[PDB]
Design a protein around this ligand. Structure first.
Ligand code: 6Z2
Length: 296
């Protein structure tokens, strides 16, 4: 229970060679979730997908996407240190709470759309968004997990045809999933047909407002599906947010020279130059991890 700068606590998840353990950054006392991946047992394609994830995770900085703090690499094992989302799975919440009232769903959906679009600003497409890919933090805010399933697929994804247009369909599914508690389309062929028809069951409690937005997402033609920037201006998206309309994610400017954190770090034996080089170089080393975590 001591992998590098971290002290391992519980095991919030296990699986196929990859296992997530709740840990604590010893220098800052902060809580993190360490994704421990055994590369010896990983196949040809999954390693390519893993390295894609690590490369993406490094560029993103959205309050609704799980932050990466450190990358601890060994020959056989890879350790990815990410922010731990205390709330749990949105899936278990939809299971327990029953479903979400449009007001609650709106708050969480604004974040989902903002986060996904932010990836799109950077020409990054998730290609597979699911309600069991969505996490909740302490204050019940969405935290999109990782890039590491079929009812969430687009029509042309069956028709044999990969860009941002795909993520727009999946968000329609996600929105429906949140407000109703169920999947809009349901063996194969039965799912293939119902998704291709486009016709989904509209629940009795749904508003005209919410159904219009679903229509903006769930469009059969991939070429006729709206962008996330034009969908952000939708009425349902801004109900109780009249002055604060949803706009493409801000992205804060870099504060690589915080005096509070740098004095504490220089005290720890870190050189002022290595603190700067690690952040400018975006190395995600023990220096970078210590700095990002100190800012909490
Ligand atoms: C364990 C795993 C995860 C991710 C998405 C899920 F939908 C379920 C589990 N997982 C991860 O890989 C990473 C991003 C490191 C992560 C961070 N935080 C949490 N929190 C959590 C999940 C479930 C119950 N209580 C807490 N799970 C994480």
């Amino acid at each position: 229970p001591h992998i590098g700068n971290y002290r391992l606590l519980k095991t919030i998840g296990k699986g196929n060679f990859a296992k997530v353990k709740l840990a604590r950054h010893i220098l800052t006392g902060k809580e993190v979730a360490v994704k421990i991946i055994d590369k010896t047992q990983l196949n040809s394609s999954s390693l390519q997908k893993l390295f894609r994830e690590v490369r993406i995770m490094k560029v993103l900085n959205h309050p609704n996407i799980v932050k990466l703090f450190e990358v601890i690499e060994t020959e056989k094992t890879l350790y990815l240190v990410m922010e731990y989302a205390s709330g749990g799975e949105v899936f278990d919440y939809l299971v327990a709470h029953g479903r979400m009232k449009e007001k609650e769903a709106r708050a969480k959906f604004r974040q989902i759309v903002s986060a996904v679009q932010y990836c799109h600003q950077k020409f990054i497409v998730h290609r597979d968004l699911k309600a069991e890919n969505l996490l909740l933090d302490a204050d019940m805010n969405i935290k999109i997990a990782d890039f590491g399933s079929p009812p969430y697929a687009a029509p042309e994804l069956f028709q044999g045809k990969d860009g941002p247009e795909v993520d727009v369909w999946s968000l329609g599914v996600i929105l429906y999933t949140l407000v109703s508690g169920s999947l809009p389309f349901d063996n194969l062929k039965e799912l293939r047909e119902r998704v291709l028809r486009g016709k989904y069951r509209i629940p009795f409690y749904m508003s005209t407002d919410c159904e219009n937005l679903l229509k903006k997402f769930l469009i059969l033609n991939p070429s006729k599906r709206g962008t996330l920037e034009q969908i952000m201006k939708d009425r349902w998206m801004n109900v109780g947010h009249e002055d604060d309309e949803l706009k493409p994610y801000v992205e804060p400017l870099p504060d690589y020279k915080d005096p509070r954190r740098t004095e504490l770090m220089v005290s720890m034996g870190y050189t002022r130059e290595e603190i700067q080089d690690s952040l400018v170089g975006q190395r995600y080393n023990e220096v970078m991890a210590t700095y990002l975590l100190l800012g909490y």
